[PDB]
Design a protein around this ligand. Structure first.
Ligand SMILES: Nc1ncnc2c1ncn2[C@@H]1O[C@H](COP(=O)(O)OP(=O)(O)O)[C@@H](O)[C@H]1O
Ligand SMILES: Nc1ncnc2c1ncn2[C@@H]1O[C@H](COP(=O)(O)OP(=O)(O)O)[C@@H](O)[C@H]1O
Ligand SMILES: [Mg+2]
Ligand SMILES: [Mg+2]
Lengths: 517, 513
């Protein structure tokens, strides 16, 4: 029975073992069957093949009746004494065994036997491996070639994850697309910055390896960044996007070895966003470098064993408070991007404030749920990703955007405590020399921000050569006792004194402008 | 039925008891069979012997068909009154029993007894014990002989673990091999140092006893250390190389008493690497000597007490912030090696600085997913291991390289807080006698480095004992009250006064080197 069932529906089911050593049934959904919303043209996980359990008792009866008709017809034809015994006994045995196909225990045994016939090696680990295929509410979406192709028929691609948002080709003439484009234009005024941020957000669709980059851009108290954060999260869906807390980013005494389930996120996710926090927070490579680079990372499943999973999710962190970074590493400050919003929406916007507007409360939340709307936004992301692939060959670094990498480098010129000390205390005051192994200088530096800015555990080994990474060593030799005593400066306390010693888009901005843009 | 099945096809399946008292089925895969990629010619773990199920369903049925033919032929010949009863009853019984082989519970029973029949003692514990055999995507390598030998046919070696990348002989004329060799030459200029590093790193293939040593090298932010470390770790396979957190070093509080789970690693691994951390890290024998030695130790095991620790993995740690080592034991520093990277990549390479070159972002972003790169890297690694075996017979200590252990002894000269204090505040100023006792000098030094570098608690006995093991005891007598008071010096304060082969570099360097 199991062999006949496999020969009769072997093209609709696959069986494979999971990491827990139990068989799992998969069913290929078809139009015209009861199903959830948007799970068409793709496999679905089945705890028990119930519809197989009813098929084996409904459709197999036709074959059994055909067999009975065949044996009856052969009994009709006259023969020798074989019809007396052989055919009669065969018919009696067959009618005895006909009712077995209805039995519950018999059906369970047949299913357990067909488990082995329907087994397909290397199916669980190859599910959703292709990053160029994306599940969609009306089939699957392929972005292997331009233009993107929508599949709404049979295929052999092992796709299981999906989102419940239908896909339509990008049409600017739809009212919702026009509204969304106008809102995006109003939220971010700069043309090049808008194009850059849209291009960066477009990569959330992709789930493969990505360039190691972090989007950390400051915004106004009322910029509206969260609105988009929620819009993209809702469009992608739970299976591809999730919300993350900022606590992980500022690593505490705990690390990856400590049990945690939040770190198990990003496993297959294509998007992750950091929302507004309470105040400016301190962080410096506190699991930041390992969250930036696309290298393979371990997977500590709480208190369970340590697995290994690849990180391929885009990350965005926007807040109204600054972020304390205390480092001078070029590598660390090379995989980050910074932008400052210039719009602060007001409910009574006077004309004398061009860089702000009125607020439409029903917006940050309104429409978000509107199905229709959703569908649209997608189209926008698909079109923008296709444009990025056409122009810059998938390299977000290769893009040209004058307003970016200038504010970022200005921010890099800030958040550096050493230069404040240099051109606040020692620069322009070289007419003295009182240095004790730079140890007194280190203490003055440490207490300086301890009172001026913030406090923390202090070490002096890293600060011994940190002075050499500045302009303070312009006169720094060593005594006969070595000790590398600085050879001129003036420690300053209290007042003291200075002792001697672009283009605006014409009508449409989504056309990206020509190659210079 | 179980006995017949074992007799007729028992050369392909074995079973053994795991640590949980559960029978496990192992099947020896063969070419021409459905299978995962690159696991050929080696055993695989089977939760349920599906092949055995199909085999007993089909081939056994063929055997029953043969038996039915035989009994029918015997019935055909005429005989006495035995045919009318005996063979008829036998044929009826056999016909009734033939359908039993198609029942699920019957198959479960015959497999349950084949578990006893197929049981082979001492199979789980003997898996992967041979360190000269390495599971590869095309079979298994034989490195106990020179040169390396690859076998892709039947064998009796019990190998189950593997890596998923095929192996090819080392051909220096391949494009990827030339690219990798050029990159290695560019990363570190010194011939002797490069040969030493490659020789040490080639030992990750082997899993037996190795010389106890720890490798540390630092320098420019773009030393490319991560580029390599990651390549070696990924090419060698996850089953043989693992990523180790720096939290293993710098033991404090819990140490090895509270539940620890990171210690279960290095069990069968052959390579362990430490990546770049946030800043400088302090450590001194803090569960470090137990990792250095290749002996047997014990500690917490996930959620258990302990089973056994026999580590064999190579250990490498590189960073951009100097490690803090405060010890004077000769044995602690014997098992240590230090190096300094003198190449810092720059995206604006001026000709005036030869110790710098232009970065390639794709060199680290891509070129890792390419299988050809991994094949070239096995080629390089096995070639280097063969060279090491041919030259120095496996003795990594006996290899000669002047710059190495020289940078190490230079580092050992530094990173010693005692000598800095001694020839910073007391030496060259002996023309005075103000020393209460050892306690005052110990305190002066303690709050000296506390501000000089970092703060910490200390034991006065250690600081009193180290005084004799210094250069300040040249004038140190004791009063009638003993106390070993220093007999003259001036504890200074404030500032005050005293009052290259052209080609074939990768093949060999001469014996003098
Ligand atoms: N393009 C737009 N069209 C209509 N309303 C907008 C637009 N941009 C912002 N707003 C309104 O202004 C507010 C954005 O300010 P903000 O306080 O930053 O919101 P949030 O932080 O919740 O995103 C939103 O509540 C939204 O209703
Ligand atoms: N042989 C090479 N030629 C050109 N660029 C290289 C080479 N090796 C490494 N690089 C680039 O320079 C950087 C080296 O730094 P990395 O490999 O991250 O290690 P670390 O940053 O710890 O020094 C990498 O980003 C890599 O892309
Ligand atoms: Mg918001
Ligand atoms: Mg690196």
């Amino acid at each position: 029975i199991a062999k006949v069932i496999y020969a009769m529906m072997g093209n609709k089911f696959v069986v494979d073992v999971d990491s827990n050593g139990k068989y799992v049934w998969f069913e290929f959904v078809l139009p015209g069957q009861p199903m959830n919303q948007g799970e068409i043209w793709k496999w679905r996980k089945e705890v028990n093949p119930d519809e197989l359990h009813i098929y084996i008792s409904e459709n197999f009866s036709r074959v059994m009746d055909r067999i009975t008709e065949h044996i009856k017809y052969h009994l009709s034809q006259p023969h020798e004494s074989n019809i007396l015994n052989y055919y009669k006994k065969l018919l009696k045995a067959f009618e005895r065994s006909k009712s077995k196909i209805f039995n519950d225990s018999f059906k369970k045994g047949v299913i357990r036997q067909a488990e082995f016939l329907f087994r397909q090696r290397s199916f669980i680990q190859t599910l959703d491996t292709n990053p160029h295929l994306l599940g969609v509410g009306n089939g699957v979406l392929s972005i292997e070639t331009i233009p993107a192709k929508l599949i709404n028929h049979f295929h052999e691609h092992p796709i299981h994850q999906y989102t419940h948002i239908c896909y339509v080709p990008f049409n600017p003439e739809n009212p919702w697309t026009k509204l969304l484009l106008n809102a995006l234009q109003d939220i971010i005024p700069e043309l090049d910055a808008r194009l850059w941020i849209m291009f960066y957000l477009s990569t959330a669709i992709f789930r493969g390896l990505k360039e190691a980059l972090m989007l950390l851009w400051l915004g106004g108290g009322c910029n509206g960044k969260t609105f988009l954060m929620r819009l993209v999260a809702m469009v992608l869906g739970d299976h591809y996007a999730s919300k993350l807390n900022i606590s992980l980013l500022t690593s505490c005494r705990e690390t990856a070895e400590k049990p945690n389930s939040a770190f198990m996120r990003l496993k297959g996710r294509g998007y992750g966003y950091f929302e507004e926090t309470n105040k400016s927070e301190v962080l410096n490579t506190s699991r930041l470098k390992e969250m930036v680079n696309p290298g393979d990372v371990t997977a500590r499943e709480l208190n369970q064993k340590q697995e290994s999973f690849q990180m391929t999710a885009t990350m965005v962190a926007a807040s109204n408070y600054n972020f304390i970074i205390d480092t001078t590493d070029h590598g660390t400050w090379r995989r980050l991007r910074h932008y400052r919003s210039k719009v602060k929406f007001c409910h009574n916007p006077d004309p004398s404030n061009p860089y702000e507007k009125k607020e439409d409360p029903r917006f940050i939340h309104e429409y978000i749920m509107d199905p229709d709307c959703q569908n649209a936004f997608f189209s926008i992301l698909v079109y923008f990703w296709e444009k990025l692939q056409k122009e810059y060959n998938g390299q977000i670094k290769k893009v040209f955007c004058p307003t970016i990498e200038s504010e970022t480098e200005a921010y890099r010129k800030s958040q550096d405590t050493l230069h404040r000390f240099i051109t606040e205390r020692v620069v322009e005051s070289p007419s003295a020399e009182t240095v004790y192994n730079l140890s007194e200088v280190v203490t003055a530096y440490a207490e300086w921000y301890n009172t001026n800015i913030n406090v923390k555990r202090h070490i002096a080994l890293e600060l011994s050569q940190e002075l050499e990474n500045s302009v303070l060593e312009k006169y720094l030799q060593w005594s006969p006792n070595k000790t590398r005593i600085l050879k001129g400066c003036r420690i300053l306390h209290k007042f003291e004194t200075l002792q001697p010693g672009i283009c605006e888009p014409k009508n449409k901005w989504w056309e990206w402008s020509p190659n210079p843009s």
